[PDB]
Write an enzyme that holds these catalytic residues in place. Sequence first.
Site, PDB file in Angstrom:
ATOM      1  N   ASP A   1      36.657  36.181  51.013  1.00 26.80           N
ATOM      2  CA  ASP A   1      37.654  37.116  51.508  1.00 26.80           C
ATOM      3  C   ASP A   1      37.258  37.846  52.812  1.00 26.80           C
ATOM      4  O   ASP A   1      36.682  38.931  52.773  1.00 26.80           O
ATOM      5  CB  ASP A   1      37.955  38.134  50.417  1.00 26.80           C
ATOM      6  CG  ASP A   1      39.146  38.992  50.735  1.00 26.80           C
ATOM      7  OD1 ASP A   1      39.691  38.898  51.842  1.00 26.80           O
ATOM      8  OD2 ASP A   1      39.557  39.763  49.858  1.00 26.80           O
ATOM      9  N   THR A   2      37.603  37.245  53.951  1.00 26.38           N
ATOM     10  CA  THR A   2      37.273  37.797  55.264  1.00 26.38           C
ATOM     11  C   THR A   2      37.926  39.158  55.484  1.00 26.38           C
ATOM     12  O   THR A   2      37.487  39.973  56.322  1.00 26.38           O
ATOM     13  CB  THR A   2      37.679  36.852  56.387  1.00 26.38           C
ATOM     14  OG1 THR A   2      39.094  36.592  56.318  1.00 26.38           O
ATOM     15  CG2 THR A   2      36.910  35.525  56.263  1.00 26.38           C
ATOM     16  N   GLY A   3      38.977  39.420  54.717  1.00 22.70           N
ATOM     17  CA  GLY A   3      39.692  40.665  54.864  1.00 22.70           C
ATOM     18  C   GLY A   3      39.074  41.817  54.089  1.00 22.70           C
ATOM     19  O   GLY A   3      39.632  42.896  54.085  1.00 22.70           O
TER      20      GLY A   3
HETATM   21  C1  LIG Z   1      44.021  44.407  51.708  1.00 22.50           C
HETATM   22  C2  LIG Z   1      42.925  45.097  52.455  1.00 22.50           C
HETATM   23  C3  LIG Z   1      43.044  46.556  52.190  1.00 22.50           C
HETATM   24  C4  LIG Z   1      41.543  44.616  51.991  1.00 22.50           C
HETATM   25  N1  LIG Z   1      41.643  43.853  50.732  1.00 22.50           N
HETATM   26  C5  LIG Z   1      41.014  42.520  50.890  1.00 22.50           C
HETATM   27  C6  LIG Z   1      42.131  41.463  50.739  1.00 22.50           C
HETATM   28  O1  LIG Z   1      41.745  40.167  51.066  1.00 22.50           O
HETATM   29  C7  LIG Z   1      42.807  41.433  49.328  1.00 22.50           C
HETATM   30  C8  LIG Z   1      41.898  40.861  48.297  1.00 22.50           C
HETATM   31  C9  LIG Z   1      42.729  40.783  47.025  1.00 22.50           C
HETATM   32  C10 LIG Z   1      43.247  41.977  46.493  1.00 22.50           C
HETATM   33  C11 LIG Z   1      44.018  41.957  45.325  1.00 22.50           C
HETATM   34  C12 LIG Z   1      44.268  40.745  44.719  1.00 22.50           C
HETATM   35  C13 LIG Z   1      43.775  39.570  45.231  1.00 22.50           C
HETATM   36  C14 LIG Z   1      42.996  39.566  46.397  1.00 22.50           C
HETATM   37  N2  LIG Z   1      43.997  40.596  49.350  1.00 22.50           N
HETATM   38  C15 LIG Z   1      45.134  41.296  49.526  1.00 22.50           C
HETATM   39  O2  LIG Z   1      45.296  42.424  49.143  1.00 22.50           O
HETATM   40  O3  LIG Z   1      46.229  40.506  49.801  1.00 22.50           O
HETATM   41  C16 LIG Z   1      47.577  40.742  49.275  1.00 22.50           C
HETATM   42  C17 LIG Z   1      48.760  40.274  50.206  1.00 22.50           C
HETATM   43  O4  LIG Z   1      48.549  38.877  50.005  1.00 22.50           O
HETATM   44  C18 LIG Z   1      48.479  38.724  48.594  1.00 22.50           C
HETATM   45  O5  LIG Z   1      47.697  37.749  48.028  1.00 22.50           O
HETATM   46  C19 LIG Z   1      46.573  38.386  47.402  1.00 22.50           C
HETATM   47  C20 LIG Z   1      47.209  39.654  46.854  1.00 22.50           C
HETATM   48  C21 LIG Z   1      48.067  39.994  48.010  1.00 22.50           C
HETATM   49  S1  LIG Z   1      41.086  44.708  49.382  1.00 22.50           S
HETATM   50  O6  LIG Z   1      42.063  45.617  48.831  1.00 22.50           O
HETATM   51  O7  LIG Z   1      40.848  43.824  48.297  1.00 22.50           O
HETATM   52  C22 LIG Z   1      39.533  45.585  49.732  1.00 22.50           C
HETATM   53  C23 LIG Z   1      39.572  46.921  50.070  1.00 22.50           C
HETATM   54  C24 LIG Z   1      38.388  47.632  50.336  1.00 22.50           C
HETATM   55  C25 LIG Z   1      37.186  46.921  50.255  1.00 22.50           C
HETATM   56  C26 LIG Z   1      35.970  47.533  50.515  1.00 22.50           C
HETATM   57  O8  LIG Z   1      35.093  46.656  50.428  1.00 22.50           O
HETATM   58  O9  LIG Z   1      36.109  48.763  50.762  1.00 22.50           O
HETATM   59  C27 LIG Z   1      37.179  45.564  49.915  1.00 22.50           C
HETATM   60  C28 LIG Z   1      38.353  44.842  49.621  1.00 22.50           C
END
Ligand SMILES: CC(C)CN(C[C@@H](O)[C@H](Cc1ccccc1)NC(=O)O[C@H]1CO[C@H]2OCC[C@H]21)S(=O)(=O)c1ccc(C(=O)O)cc1
Lengths: 99, 99
Positions: free
Chosen positions: B25-27
């Site tokens: 997860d690059t995001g």
């Molecule tokens: C969205 C953004 C805010 C960062 N996020 C990473 C992102 O790739 C997240 C990872 C994730 C989260 C929930 C369920 C599945 C996958 N993906 C993400 O939220 O994507 C959304 C829109 O596209 C959809 O498909 C997946 C679920 C939906 S995160 O919420 O998971 C996150 C936040 C903070 C940290 C941190 O390390 O502080 C790490 C990860």
Amino acid sequence: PQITLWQRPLVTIKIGGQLKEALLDTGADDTVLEEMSLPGRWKPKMIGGIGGFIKVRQYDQILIEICGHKAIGTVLVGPTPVNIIGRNLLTQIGCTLNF
Amino acid sequence: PQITLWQRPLVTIKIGGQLKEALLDTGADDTVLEEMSLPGRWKPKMIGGIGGFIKVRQYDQILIEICGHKAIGTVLVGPTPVNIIGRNLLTQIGCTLNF
Ligand SMILES: CC(C)CN(C[C@@H](O)[C@H](Cc1ccccc1)NC(=O)O[C@H]1CO[C@H]2OCC[C@H]21)S(=O)(=O)c1ccc(C(=O)O)cc1
């Protein structure tokens, strides 16, 4: 380009005649952008992330220029904390993961 | 391995003696995994995502073998809906984005 991950993979994009910066996000199925004005019709929808769900507006066949590569498809708009470019558009620009 | 994004980039990992599947997860800045039993002492923390924030346990110097590549760093444990490998560990395995 090849992009390492010591820093957030932020890229400059052009959508709806506006310039934004967005995360290349392999963990996101869809593209989600913060509230912005975008032309046309949309259908309401809920997408689920880490802390729960948000209501988004779904826009289909929306053009985006991501690092100079054009792509068209679905863009969700609503109260995401960051603009996220998801796999739906990443595959169009030929983006891959390598290790 | 090269990994294309037409499907979720799911990888098998081994942590704390157990086998899980996780999202490359690059995001994501940090690594967050669902509720699971991990050895040491942890610290309380809150991280924010699409739908808002969740409380997690921070564990430092934790060993993970991600696609048979070893890495050590911070792992957050708490109620994420999917297991996510973030950039904190992606950089350790040599993972890059390419287009
Ligand atoms: C969205 C953004 C805010 C960062 N996020 C990473 C992102 O790739 C997240 C990872 C994730 C989260 C929930 C369920 C599945 C996958 N993906 C993400 O939220 O994507 C959304 C829109 O596209 C959809 O498909 C997946 C679920 C939906 S995160 O919420 O998971 C996150 C936040 C903070 C940290 C941190 O390390 O502080 C790490 C990860």
